[PDB]
């Protein structure tokens, strides 16, 4: 039966009508009147804000804590009151702590530090990956493997590294170093759900690594160095907080690379690479006489 032929015409007509459909769309779509678009779900990723206001935080549902019964009474310092059977986090407290964390993220990126954004909940992968992209950092959206910091030789043994200068240009002549070197640990960890991964945060406490976390009404605030009291169960509040910290890192990386063009390095060679220079000159000093 030729009933499949006319169906073929449909598959052959898609390139045609599609081009025509897209053209006519740009003609009669925005004629009637203008619309004031105040919210788009994809706004926190496409164009995150540099700073969060009280209205942005409240609209993102960052003030909705957990049930009053499931509360860590230690973090009663950030709670504004009780309503709808839950604890309300003070909007002023979330804003102040968020502007402070943004400074930490900006300075660590300004001093050439390695940052790690960690959001493991289901719908947090696009958020963490976007934040790490802006700040030129690392991302983690799956279950943290216990020991990736305190036991980095086993877990991060064969992962490749590279040596770069103040302008992030790859330097040649460190082949012997990169082969015999201890794997890297993050200089800053931004956790979007501390309650769910305390193994990661405890290794940062042992390794002396500063950490930033979203502390919900039931989360222990002693697990991170810099707390951001806010609702960690909302993907709208997590995208705003993460986007604001991503802009902080981006704004810090811009200053670091601008100072480099002027010949001003905002950091010093780490101790790991520093020692390599010493023994490297020794091998040159040995051959100096011989």
């Amino acid at each position: 039966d030729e009933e499949a032929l006319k169906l073929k015409q449909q598959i052959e007509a898609i390139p045609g009508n599609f081009k025509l459909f897209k053209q006519t769309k740009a003609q009669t779509q925005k004629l009637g009147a203008g619309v004031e678009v105040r919210y788009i779900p994809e706004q926190y990723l496409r164009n995150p804000p540099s700073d969060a206001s009280l209205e942005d935080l409240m609209a993102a549902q960052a003030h909705m804590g957990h049930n009053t019964s499931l509360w860590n009474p230690a973090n009663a310092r950030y709670i504004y009151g009780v309503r709808q059977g839950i604890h309300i986090i003070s909007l002023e407290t979330t804003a102040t702590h968020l502007r402070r964390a943004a400074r930490v993220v900006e300075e660590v990126a300004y001093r050439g530090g390695l940052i790690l954004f960690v959001g493991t909940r289901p719908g947090q992968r696009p958020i963490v990956v976007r934040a790490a992209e802006l700040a030129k950092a690392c991302h983690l959206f799956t279950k943290w493997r216990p020991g990736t910091i305190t036991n980095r030789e086993q877990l991060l043994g064969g992962v490749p590294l590279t040596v770069v200068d103040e302008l992030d240009r790859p330097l040649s002549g460190f082949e012997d170093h990169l082969h015999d070197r201890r794997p890297l640990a993050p200089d800053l960890v931004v956790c979007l759900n501390p309650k769910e991964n305390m193994t990661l945060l405890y290794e940062c406490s042992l390794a002396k690594i500063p950490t930033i976390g979203i502390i919900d009404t039931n989360t222990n605030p002693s697990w991170v160095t810099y707390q951001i009291p806010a609702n960690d169960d909302s993907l709208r509040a997590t995208a705003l907080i993460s986007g604001v910290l991503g802009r902080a890192g981006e704004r810090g990386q811009k200053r670091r690379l601008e100072a480099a063009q002027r010949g001003v390095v905002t950091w010093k060679t780490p101790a790991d690479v520093q020692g390599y220079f010493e023994l490297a000159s020794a091998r040159a000093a040995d051959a100096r006489r011989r």
Binding site: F18, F141, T142, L161, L178, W267, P270
Partner: protein, 247 residues
């Protein structure tokens, strides 16, 4: 020649601390393409050419990572989604990344050679049993059967074995259509009888290939691989053990 004064080690990939760096780097690239070419039209799955995508094992070996089946199952749903894009409208970027997920494995081909028919119209079939091997030459005839020159009754002194030797012709009701000239060797009475069953069945299919569905249900196509088990040291026979004394 001297090294650069300012230098610091930096991870190459952004997925440095993840479980599988190389996998996520490739998975995030698909997420970026899908999010970019989501508006392009698609084609119903019925009109999508079937492709043999790689397996979870081919990826583990290729990337040298211990990828998870659940995380790979969702990475496979993207390539199937992107593959559904219209070919003409499909960008060159998606065409290339998809070619890296194709599985170009070809199974080995082993086709048996068909049994010919001699110029005199006789086809030779071969059957085997416990220790016997038969060669049956089936020809258009009246129903005369010879086994090593002797008649069917002068050779098998057990009617059960006679019916089993020519069971293929009996099941298909063709005893009076062909003449068989069998030549058996080795084995015993029942071993040779069942060996001729398979021999005539194969030779018969050379004349009328459309009888295999019937010889199947008759049980004349299957080769019975049962064989005497060897004697094993410490045993009286293949499996019989000597008397075990507890005290």
């Amino acid at each position: 020649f001297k090294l650069h004064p300012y230098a610091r080690a930096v991870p190459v990939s952004p997925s440095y601390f993840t479980r599988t760096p190389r996998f996520y780097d490739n998975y995030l690239s698909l997420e970026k393409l899908m999010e970019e070419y989501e508006d392009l039209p698609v084609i119903p799955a019925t009109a999508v050419e079937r492709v043999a995508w790689k397996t979870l094992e081919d990826i583990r070996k290729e990337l040298g990572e211990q990828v998870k089946a659940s995380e790979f199952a969702r990475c496979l749903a993207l390539v199937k989604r992107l593959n559904s894009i219209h070919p003409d409208l499909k960008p060159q970027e998606i065409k290339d990344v998809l070619d890296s997920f194709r599985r170009n494995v070809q199974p080995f081909t082993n086709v048996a050679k068909p049994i010919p028919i001699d110029q005199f119209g006789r086809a030779c079939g071969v059957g085997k049993r416990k220790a016997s091997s038969a060669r049956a030459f089936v020809v258009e005839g009246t129903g005369e059967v010879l086994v090593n020159g002797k008649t069917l009754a002068e050779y098998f002194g057990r009617v059960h074995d006679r019916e089993s030797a020519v069971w293929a012709l009996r099941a298909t009701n063709r005893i009076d259509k062909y003449n068989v000239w069998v030549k058996v060797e080795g084995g015993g009475t029942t071993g040779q009888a069942e060996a001729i069953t398979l021999a005539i069945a194969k030779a018969l299919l050379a004349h009328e290939p459309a009888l295999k569905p019937a010889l199947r249900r008759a049980g004349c196509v299957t080769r019975d691989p049962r064989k005497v088990e060897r004697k094993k040291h410490g045993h009286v026979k293949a499996r019989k053990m000597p008397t075990w004394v507890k005290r």
